């Protein structure tokens, strides 16, 4: 969409992810499998929920309605009465229809950042310890087990810890060693 | 060889929505906000019976039409329900 | 008829009485909450 994640570089959603709206899949010597980022799926829901509750709270002071009755020779003030209600119900319909259509467009392009910005957090933590592969996905220079995945997932990876593991690899897939 | 992706949820969902730019966008999750149904009956408004005048008009009831007898002295009411063209007017 | 609901809006009939949802003239009115569901 706007932010270019959903229906963007991350081509299509995973059906295998059921626990939540956004998450990580991994692969390593032991593991392989999905795991939703509940804490930020959770933050997203707090939003979309507030949004519904905001609209209900705007629609209790609409234009109200109770009834009135007219003589046969007052026909044209009957009309005026009718143009009125039918003016006001033309106007709250538009406001409803348009509010939904707009807040729908924003809600969809909200999810499209939720996902971009999740991708950017993983990125900023892992720097040149991992190779950004470009289809939504990173592969590591240092091997990184299930206990290290959580650390990425819960956002407390530790760059300096795997630095020389990683840069031994970078150093050699640069074939700079190939000179001896 | 070891690796980790970011991604988003997808499901068996059929329901579609509109926007200013996109009509019929299929999404994983919806929420109707439009009531469309009723019970076809006249009911109480909070444990307070209405006044269904049946085939009297208000005028038929107040003036004291001999057809409108079963209304000769009525209990308190929530609201009043006159017919389309009540047979027993003046 | 008597209307039942929690929904902000209804479309049964304009002249209500009581604490009701709010009449609009539409046939369908759905908010999106989830992601674009274009899978794979």
């Amino acid at each position, epitope marked *: 969409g706007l932010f270019g994640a959903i229906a963007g570089f991350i081509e299509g959603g995973w059906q295998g992810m059921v626990d*939540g709206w956004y998450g990580y899949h991994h692969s390593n010597e032991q593991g392989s499998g999905y795991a939703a980022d509940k804490e930020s799926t959770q933050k997203a829901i707090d939003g979309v929920t507030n949004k519904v*509750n905001s609209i209900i709270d705007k629609m209790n002071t609409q234009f109200e309605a109770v009834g009135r009755e007219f003589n046969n020779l007052e026909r044209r003030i009957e009309n005026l009465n009718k143009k009125m209600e039918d003016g006001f119900l033309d106007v709250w319909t538009y406001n409803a229809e348009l509010l939904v259509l707009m807040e729908n467009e924003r809600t969809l392009d909200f999810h499209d950042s939720n996902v971009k910005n999740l991708y950017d957090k993983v990125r900023l933590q892992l720097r040149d310890n991992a190779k950004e592969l470009g289809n939504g996905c990173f592969e590591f220079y240092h091997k990184c087990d299930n206990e290290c995945m959580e650390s990425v997932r819960n956002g407390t990876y530790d760059y300096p810890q795997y630095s020389e593991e990683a840069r031994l690899k970078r150093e050699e897939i640069s074939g700079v060693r190939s000179l001896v | 060889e070891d690796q980790i992706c970011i991604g988003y949820h997808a499901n068996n969902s059929t329901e579609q929505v509109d926007t200013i730019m996109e009509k019929n966008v299929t999404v994983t999750h919806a929420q109707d906000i439009l009531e469309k149904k009723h019970n076809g009956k006249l009911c109480d408004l909070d444990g307070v019976k209405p006044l269904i005048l049946r085939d009297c008009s208000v005028a038929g009831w107040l003036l004291g039409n001999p057809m409108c007898d079963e209304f000769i002295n009525v209990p308190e009411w929530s609201y009043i329900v006159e017919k389309a063209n009540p047979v027993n007017d003046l | 008829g008597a209307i039942n609901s929690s929904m902000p809006f209804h479309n049964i009939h304009p002249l209500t009485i009581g604490e009701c949802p709010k009449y609009v003239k539409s046939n369908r009115l759905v908010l999106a909450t989830g992601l674009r569901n274009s899978p794979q």
Partner: single-chain antibody
Amino acid sequence: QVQLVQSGAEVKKPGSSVKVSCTSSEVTFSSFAISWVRQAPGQGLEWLGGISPMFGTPNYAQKFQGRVTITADQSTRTAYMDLRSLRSEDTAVYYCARSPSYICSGGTCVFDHWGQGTLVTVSSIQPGLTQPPSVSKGLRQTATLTCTGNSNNVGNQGAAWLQQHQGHPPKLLSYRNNDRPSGISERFSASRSGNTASLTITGLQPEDEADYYCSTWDSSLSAVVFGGGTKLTVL
């Protein structure tokens, strides 16, 4: 406010299953996980399982891992508990409770809103947390009630406390991080220190003397966990 509302009191024959349901006032209902928690005559609370309406993934306690099936419907605003293979140890009142978390899979699963209860009778308990069963302090005195636990449960999540007068279903007095909800009176400090947490009541009065349950998520047991109980007696 939100209100849950449950089914009529069922009586059942050993073997024969039950289905019991509750339904929610609030429109934003797919945002909140719903749970089922029974209370057999007298004792204390026990969480069977729970569901995310939004996603419809449930998770159950192992004691019921294959016997029960619980699900929620989105269109109508309702969730169901299907307790198959019924028997005698099962007779209880069954509450549905809403967690403010959208899923019931961790500490954030506290219970802020409870249904009125469904008594299910069959025809012809071990607490996971540890509370003394009877604290008794005097009028206008301070009581401190303690839940103690370990690193799997209390020591990582913390705890939510609950109040239960005879008759009524339980009311929540603290979220898992020691904030109090709207209603709760401003003289109920929750707190937590390591693997033990203490609801401290200040300025007692007849009102206060009920049962008190702590609760949390046990990360080993893959499920929700309650202490035994503590009857407060003012005097």
